[PDB]
Ligand binder design. Sequence first.
Ligand code: HEM
Ligand code: HEM
Lengths: 176, 176
Amino acid sequence: MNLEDLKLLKEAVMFTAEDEEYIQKAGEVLEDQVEEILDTWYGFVGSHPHLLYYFTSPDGTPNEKYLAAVRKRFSRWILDTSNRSYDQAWLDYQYEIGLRHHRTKKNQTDNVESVPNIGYRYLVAFIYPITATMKPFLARKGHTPEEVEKMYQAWFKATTLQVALWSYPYVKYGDF
Amino acid sequence: MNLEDLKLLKEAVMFTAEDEEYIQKAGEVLEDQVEEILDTWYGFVGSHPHLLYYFTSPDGTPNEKYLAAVRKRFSRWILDTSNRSYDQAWLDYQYEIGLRHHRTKKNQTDNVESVPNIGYRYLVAFIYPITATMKPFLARKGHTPEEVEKMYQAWFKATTLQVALWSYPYVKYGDF
Ligand code: HEM
Ligand code: HEM
């Protein structure tokens, strides 16, 4: 996609200049608390065997080196999402994040042997737990509940926007 | 999909028996305000030419009979989502709703001529506006702010859960 297509997708998730201010604020509050955000996030993935599965070795046990490498890139993604203006380099990388969940690129970044593809049903599903994970963190620090709501809404839009972008390599050609 | 697989998907959106109580409450609140919801929902769609596009005749003008027919089924959907328990018949219908946004069955239920396919990027994107539309209505029936937030979160889960199920015909065979 280019920036014209992005503008149309942003309109569909109701993402505006107001959300670019509040996603920067969310980022500020989240970057503060990244270590326990990560513990929360991997604790949810880790508590369901059918989810933890996508990180496992052939023998069905978690590949700890894979989990470690991914945790680092997840923590970087929290900051990337929080910036003032999504540009073409950002868009190009969103494609890359989707290719990495999909069989096209999964397991190549870390050079691991793991399951070949993340079922698309779960990438969509994960919009919810991603927003649910951040919510209590956004509510910490020192902000009003009205500011907290706008940060949370901003976060929800950005996550939805991104997953829709990540879905490209999964979708039958011409149906995206 | 069978009910075993729906259970795993419900786990991925954090949908539990607690969400079953509050989705029913959310449905109670929403159905008594349905006509207002529908006008709000179709004002959003109708206000963006690139979204209104999906309801238009080849000559570019909105098919009014198409819009009227879809609006009645969308109305049933608000109620169907608030069921006690999602059963096999419910699951089978979700496949159908997905087929109908997709080129597979689009335009066939109302026997209309319109654009052949809704691009998948927007089905994911609409998770946000769907939840954003419902939110002020859930606060309008004299429930505690705690129950309002619980109804809102359950709506968000059920919406995310359904779109994931509707993705099936759009996803490359074997990657779902
Ligand atoms: C809302 C949905 C999701 C978000 C926001 C998210 C976030 C991310 C991020 C930021 C990365 C690193 C991308 C990079 O290389 O820079 C990643 C990779 C990864 N995620 Fe997700 N993720 C989502 C869905 C899922 C699901 C459903 C699973 C299943 C457990 C999963 C498991 C993985 C795995 C195994 C990788 C490594 C892929 C590889 O080998 O490169 N993710 N995710
Ligand atoms: C969260 C996302 C969405 C939800 C919850 C939703 C809801 C629904 C429902 C309940 C129906 C009727 C299903 C039935 O036949 O019983 C429907 C059909 C339809 N929707 Fe959506 N929708 C979504 C995404 C979209 C998008 C992005 C568009 C683009 C404008 C759209 C436009 C249409 C059209 C044109 C139909 C008629 C399809 C046909 O010819 O049968 N929907 N939708």
